[PDB]
Protein backbone atom coordinates (compact mmCIF):
# COMPACT_ATOMS: atom_id res chain seq x y z
CA UNK A 1 0.00 0.00 0.00
CA UNK A 2 2.20 2.82 -1.35
CA UNK A 3 2.26 6.46 -0.12
CA UNK A 4 0.22 9.04 -2.00
CA UNK A 5 2.39 11.28 -4.20
CA UNK A 6 1.75 15.00 -4.03
CA UNK A 7 3.25 17.00 -6.88
CA UNK A 8 3.35 20.76 -7.01
CA UNK A 9 4.62 23.11 -9.71
CA UNK A 10 6.31 26.18 -8.27
CA UNK A 11 5.70 29.40 -10.21
CA UNK A 12 6.16 27.07 -13.18
CA UNK A 13 9.90 27.13 -12.47
CA UNK A 14 10.18 23.50 -11.36
CA UNK A 15 8.15 20.72 -9.73
CA UNK A 16 8.63 18.95 -6.37
CA UNK A 17 6.84 15.61 -5.89
CA UNK A 18 7.07 14.19 -2.37
CA UNK A 19 5.85 11.33 -0.18
CA UNK A 20 6.36 10.05 3.36
CA UNK A 21 7.78 6.53 3.12
CA UNK A 22 8.44 5.82 6.80
CA UNK A 23 5.09 4.07 7.29
CA UNK A 24 13.48 0.98 5.22
CA UNK A 25 12.81 1.02 1.48
CA UNK A 26 13.91 3.00 -1.56
CA UNK A 27 10.70 3.47 -3.52
CA UNK A 28 11.17 4.74 -7.08
CA UNK A 29 9.32 7.35 -9.12
CA UNK A 30 8.57 7.15 -12.82
CA UNK A 31 6.47 9.50 -14.94
CA UNK A 32 5.04 9.99 -18.42
CA UNK A 33 2.64 12.24 -20.36
CA UNK A 34 -0.43 10.27 -21.43
CA UNK A 35 -1.94 10.74 -24.91
CA UNK A 36 0.72 13.07 -26.28
CA UNK A 37 4.21 13.52 -27.78
CA UNK A 38 7.07 11.82 -25.94
CA UNK A 39 4.86 9.13 -24.42
CA UNK A 40 8.11 7.39 -23.51
CA UNK A 41 8.57 6.47 -19.83
CA UNK A 42 11.14 8.72 -18.15
CA UNK A 43 13.22 7.72 -15.13
CA UNK A 44 13.78 10.21 -12.31
CA UNK A 45 16.96 12.20 -13.00
CA UNK A 46 16.83 14.06 -9.69
CA UNK A 47 15.86 12.49 -6.37
CA UNK A 48 14.97 14.31 -3.17
CA UNK A 49 15.82 12.51 0.07
CA UNK A 50 14.65 12.18 3.67
CA UNK A 51 17.03 10.34 6.00
CA UNK A 52 19.08 8.78 3.16
CA UNK A 53 15.79 7.52 1.74
CA UNK A 54 13.94 8.56 -1.42
CA UNK A 55 11.34 11.12 -0.37
CA UNK A 56 10.49 12.71 -3.71
CA UNK A 57 11.53 13.69 -7.21
CA UNK A 58 12.19 17.13 -8.70
CA UNK A 59 11.33 17.92 -12.33
CA UNK A 60 13.02 20.96 -13.87
CA UNK A 61 11.46 23.58 -16.16
CA UNK A 62 12.00 21.67 -19.39
CA UNK A 63 10.38 18.51 -18.02
CA UNK A 64 7.21 20.36 -17.07
CA UNK A 65 4.21 20.45 -19.37
CA UNK A 66 1.12 21.92 -17.76
CA UNK A 67 -1.95 21.34 -19.92
CA UNK A 68 -0.55 17.95 -20.81
CA UNK A 69 -1.89 15.21 -18.56
CA UNK A 70 0.92 14.19 -16.17
CA UNK A 71 1.16 10.57 -15.00
CA UNK A 72 3.41 9.78 -12.05
CA UNK A 73 4.11 6.28 -10.71
CA UNK A 74 5.67 5.08 -7.42
CA UNK A 75 7.43 1.68 -7.58
CA UNK A 76 8.55 -0.71 -4.86
CA UNK A 77 11.66 -2.13 -6.55
CA UNK A 78 11.21 -5.48 -4.81
CA UNK A 79 7.79 -6.23 -6.32
CA UNK A 80 6.62 -5.07 -9.77
CA UNK A 81 3.09 -5.66 -8.55
CA UNK A 82 3.33 -2.99 -5.86
CA UNK A 83 2.87 0.17 -7.94
CA UNK A 84 0.49 3.12 -7.64
CA UNK A 85 -0.15 5.66 -10.40
CA UNK A 86 -1.81 9.09 -10.52
CA UNK A 87 -2.88 11.18 -13.51
CA UNK A 88 -2.35 14.85 -12.80
CA UNK A 89 -3.64 18.11 -14.18
CA UNK A 90 -0.54 20.23 -13.68
CA UNK A 91 -2.14 23.65 -14.34
CA UNK A 92 -4.28 23.06 -11.23
CA UNK A 93 -1.15 22.55 -9.11
CA UNK A 94 0.80 25.71 -9.81
CA UNK A 95 1.91 27.74 -6.81
CA UNK A 96 3.09 31.25 -7.65
CA UNK A 97 5.94 32.86 -5.74
CA UNK A 98 4.32 35.22 -3.22
CA UNK A 99 3.71 38.91 -4.10
CA UNK A 100 6.65 41.33 -3.66
CA UNK A 101 7.44 45.06 -3.45
CA UNK A 102 4.34 46.09 -1.56
CA UNK A 103 3.74 49.85 -1.75
CA UNK A 104 1.02 52.17 -0.47
CA UNK A 105 0.32 55.70 -1.76
CA UNK A 106 -2.47 58.27 -1.31
CA UNK A 107 -4.90 59.55 -3.97
CA UNK A 108 -6.61 61.65 -1.34
CA UNK A 109 -6.26 62.53 2.34
CA UNK A 110 -8.54 59.56 3.08
CA UNK A 111 -8.15 57.16 0.17
CA UNK A 112 -5.37 54.58 -0.29
CA UNK A 113 -4.19 52.30 -3.11
CA UNK A 114 -2.17 49.15 -2.54
CA UNK A 115 0.08 47.70 -5.26
CA UNK A 116 2.34 44.69 -5.88
CA UNK A 117 4.29 42.63 -8.43
CA UNK A 118 4.41 38.94 -9.35
CA UNK A 119 7.58 36.96 -10.10
CA UNK A 120 6.79 35.64 -13.61
CA UNK A 121 3.15 35.10 -14.54
CA UNK A 122 0.93 38.22 -14.50
CA UNK A 123 -2.54 37.97 -16.05
CA UNK A 124 -2.64 34.44 -14.69
CA UNK A 125 -2.81 35.29 -11.00
CA UNK A 126 -5.68 36.22 -8.76
CA UNK A 127 -5.09 37.71 -5.34
CA UNK A 128 -6.25 37.91 -1.72
CA UNK A 129 -5.75 41.19 0.13
CA UNK A 130 -5.79 40.96 3.90
CA UNK A 131 -5.71 44.01 6.16
CA UNK A 132 -6.38 44.89 9.75
CA UNK A 133 -5.77 47.90 11.99
CA UNK A 134 -4.22 47.97 15.44
CA UNK A 135 -7.89 47.86 16.43
CA UNK A 136 -9.15 44.72 14.70
CA UNK A 137 -9.56 41.27 16.21
CA UNK A 138 -9.37 39.83 12.73
CA UNK A 139 -8.38 40.32 9.10
CA UNK A 140 -10.63 42.01 6.58
CA UNK A 141 -9.96 39.99 3.43
CA UNK A 142 -10.93 40.83 -0.16
CA UNK A 143 -10.44 38.99 -3.45
CA UNK A 144 -8.96 41.00 -6.33
CA UNK A 145 -8.45 40.12 -10.00
CA UNK A 146 -5.55 40.61 -12.37
CA UNK A 147 -5.34 44.37 -11.91
CA UNK A 148 -2.86 43.90 -9.13
CA UNK A 149 -4.21 46.81 -7.17
CA UNK A 150 -6.44 47.27 -4.16
CA UNK A 151 -8.24 50.43 -3.15
CA UNK A 152 -9.05 51.41 0.42
CA UNK A 153 -11.73 54.11 0.03
CA UNK A 154 -11.97 55.13 3.70
CA UNK A 155 -9.11 55.06 6.19
CA UNK A 156 -8.58 56.32 9.74
CA UNK A 157 -5.43 58.41 10.28
CA UNK A 158 -5.36 57.88 14.04
CA UNK A 159 -5.11 54.14 13.46
CA UNK A 160 -2.19 52.10 12.09
CA UNK A 161 -2.83 49.67 9.21
CA UNK A 162 -1.26 46.37 8.16
CA UNK A 163 -1.55 44.91 4.63
CA UNK A 164 -0.58 41.54 3.13
CA UNK A 165 -1.26 39.64 -0.09
CA UNK A 166 -1.09 36.09 -1.42
CA UNK A 167 -1.68 34.84 -4.95
CA UNK A 168 -3.28 31.89 -6.73
CA UNK A 169 -2.91 30.32 -10.19
CA UNK A 170 -6.58 30.56 -11.16
CA UNK A 171 -8.88 30.62 -13.10
CA UNK A 172 -7.56 31.62 -16.54
CA UNK A 173 -4.46 29.45 -16.96
CA UNK A 174 -5.42 26.73 -14.46
CA UNK A 175 -7.74 25.83 -11.61
CA UNK A 176 -5.47 25.64 -8.59
CA UNK A 177 -6.91 25.67 -5.10
CA UNK A 178 -3.71 26.37 -3.22
CA UNK A 179 -2.40 29.87 -2.49
CA UNK A 180 1.18 31.12 -2.40
CA UNK A 181 2.63 32.09 0.95
CA UNK A 182 1.88 35.61 2.17
CA UNK A 183 3.90 38.55 0.97
CA UNK A 184 5.91 40.53 3.47
CA UNK A 185 3.35 42.74 5.19
CA UNK A 186 3.73 46.51 4.97
CA UNK A 187 2.43 49.19 7.32
CA UNK A 188 0.65 52.57 7.14
Amino acid sequence: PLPEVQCFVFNVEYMNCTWQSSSPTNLTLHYWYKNSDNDKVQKCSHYLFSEEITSGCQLQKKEIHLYQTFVVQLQDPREPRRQATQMLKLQNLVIPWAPENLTLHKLSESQLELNWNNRFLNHCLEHLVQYRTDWDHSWTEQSVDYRHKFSLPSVDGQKRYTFRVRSRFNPLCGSAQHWSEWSHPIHW
Binding site: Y67, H123, L172
Partner: protein, 121 residues
Protein backbone atom coordinates in the same frame (compact mmCIF):
# COMPACT_ATOMS: atom_id res chain seq x y z
CA UNK B 1 -5.79 41.34 -33.08
CA UNK B 2 -4.60 38.55 -30.78
CA UNK B 3 -5.82 41.14 -28.30
CA UNK B 4 -9.34 40.71 -29.62
CA UNK B 5 -8.68 36.95 -29.69
CA UNK B 6 -7.61 36.22 -26.12
CA UNK B 7 -10.56 38.12 -24.66
CA UNK B 8 -13.03 35.92 -26.51
CA UNK B 9 -11.33 32.77 -25.16
CA UNK B 10 -11.33 34.11 -21.64
CA UNK B 11 -15.09 34.37 -22.11
CA UNK B 12 -15.59 30.90 -23.57
CA UNK B 13 -13.62 29.42 -20.70
CA UNK B 14 -15.78 31.46 -18.36
CA UNK B 15 -19.23 29.94 -18.87
CA UNK B 16 -17.71 26.61 -19.67
CA UNK B 17 -17.02 26.83 -15.95
CA UNK B 18 -20.50 28.19 -15.29
CA UNK B 19 -21.82 24.83 -16.53
CA UNK B 20 -19.18 22.93 -14.57
CA UNK B 21 -19.71 25.04 -11.45
CA UNK B 22 -23.43 24.42 -11.85
CA UNK B 23 -23.56 20.64 -12.09
CA UNK B 24 -21.54 19.78 -8.97
CA UNK B 25 -23.68 21.31 -6.19
CA UNK B 26 -26.58 19.59 -7.92
CA UNK B 27 -30.21 12.94 -11.43
CA UNK B 28 -26.49 13.72 -11.75
CA UNK B 29 -26.62 9.96 -11.51
CA UNK B 30 -28.62 9.61 -14.71
CA UNK B 31 -26.63 12.61 -15.96
CA UNK B 32 -23.18 11.14 -15.38
CA UNK B 33 -24.19 8.33 -17.75
CA UNK B 34 -24.44 10.08 -21.14
CA UNK B 35 -21.18 9.45 -22.94
CA UNK B 36 -19.37 12.26 -24.74
CA UNK B 37 -16.45 11.90 -27.14
CA UNK B 38 -13.35 14.06 -26.71
CA UNK B 39 -10.82 15.13 -29.32
CA UNK B 40 -7.81 12.94 -29.98
CA UNK B 41 -5.70 16.08 -30.06
CA UNK B 42 -6.78 19.55 -28.96
CA UNK B 43 -3.88 21.97 -29.26
CA UNK B 44 -4.54 24.53 -31.98
CA UNK B 45 -7.60 26.80 -32.01
CA UNK B 46 -9.00 25.20 -35.16
CA UNK B 47 -9.40 22.05 -33.07
CA UNK B 48 -12.36 23.70 -31.32
CA UNK B 49 -14.44 22.26 -34.13
CA UNK B 50 -14.38 19.00 -32.20
CA UNK B 51 -16.10 21.07 -29.49
CA UNK B 52 -18.82 22.44 -31.74
CA UNK B 53 -19.83 18.94 -32.82
CA UNK B 54 -20.66 17.78 -29.30
CA UNK B 55 -22.69 20.83 -28.29
CA UNK B 56 -25.97 19.35 -29.51
CA UNK B 57 -25.62 16.53 -27.01
CA UNK B 58 -24.41 18.95 -24.30
CA UNK B 59 -27.82 20.62 -24.45
CA UNK B 60 -29.87 17.41 -24.54
CA UNK B 61 -27.89 16.45 -21.43
CA UNK B 62 -28.57 19.60 -19.44
CA UNK B 63 -32.31 19.46 -20.14
CA UNK B 64 -32.37 16.29 -18.05
CA UNK B 65 -32.16 18.50 -15.00
CA UNK B 66 -34.89 21.10 -14.88
CA UNK B 67 -33.99 24.78 -14.83
CA UNK B 68 -34.35 25.71 -11.15
CA UNK B 69 -30.98 24.39 -9.93
CA UNK B 70 -28.65 25.81 -12.60
CA UNK B 71 -27.80 29.53 -12.58
CA UNK B 72 -27.65 29.42 -16.34
CA UNK B 73 -30.29 28.94 -19.05
CA UNK B 74 -29.24 25.75 -20.86
CA UNK B 75 -30.47 26.55 -24.34
CA UNK B 76 -28.79 29.92 -23.74
CA UNK B 77 -25.24 29.06 -22.63
CA UNK B 78 -24.94 26.42 -25.32
CA UNK B 79 -26.43 28.85 -27.84
CA UNK B 80 -23.71 31.21 -26.66
CA UNK B 81 -20.76 28.82 -26.58
CA UNK B 82 -21.61 27.78 -30.14
CA UNK B 83 -21.28 31.40 -31.21
CA UNK B 84 -17.85 31.58 -29.61
CA UNK B 85 -16.83 28.20 -31.00
CA UNK B 86 -17.86 29.37 -34.45
CA UNK B 87 -16.01 32.70 -34.65
CA UNK B 88 -12.97 30.98 -33.22
CA UNK B 89 -12.08 28.50 -35.98
CA UNK B 90 -12.39 30.26 -39.38
CA UNK B 91 -10.15 20.16 -41.80
CA UNK B 92 -12.25 17.46 -40.11
CA UNK B 93 -12.65 16.51 -36.45
CA UNK B 94 -11.13 13.12 -35.62
CA UNK B 95 -12.26 11.60 -32.34
CA UNK B 96 -10.74 9.68 -29.46
CA UNK B 97 -11.49 6.08 -28.48
CA UNK B 98 -12.51 6.38 -24.83
CA UNK B 99 -15.71 8.08 -23.66
CA UNK B 100 -16.01 10.63 -20.84
CA UNK B 101 -18.64 12.06 -18.49
CA UNK B 102 -19.99 15.58 -18.93
CA UNK B 103 -17.67 16.58 -16.09
CA UNK B 104 -14.56 14.92 -17.52
CA UNK B 105 -15.75 16.57 -20.74
CA UNK B 106 -15.88 20.21 -19.66
CA UNK B 107 -12.75 19.78 -17.56
CA UNK B 108 -10.97 18.87 -20.79
CA UNK B 109 -12.14 21.83 -22.90
CA UNK B 110 -11.85 24.25 -20.00
CA UNK B 111 -8.22 23.22 -19.87
CA UNK B 112 -7.96 23.43 -23.63
CA UNK B 113 -8.81 27.10 -23.17
CA UNK B 114 -6.39 27.69 -20.30
CA UNK B 115 -3.62 26.42 -22.56
CA UNK B 116 -4.19 28.93 -25.35
CA UNK B 117 -4.89 31.64 -22.78
CA UNK B 118 -1.51 30.99 -21.20
CA UNK B 119 0.53 30.59 -24.40
CA UNK B 120 -0.77 33.97 -25.51
CA UNK B 121 0.26 36.89 -23.30
Amino acid sequence: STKKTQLQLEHLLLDLQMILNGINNYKLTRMLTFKFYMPKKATELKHLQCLEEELKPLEEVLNLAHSKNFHFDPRDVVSNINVFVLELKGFMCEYADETATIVEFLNRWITFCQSIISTLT
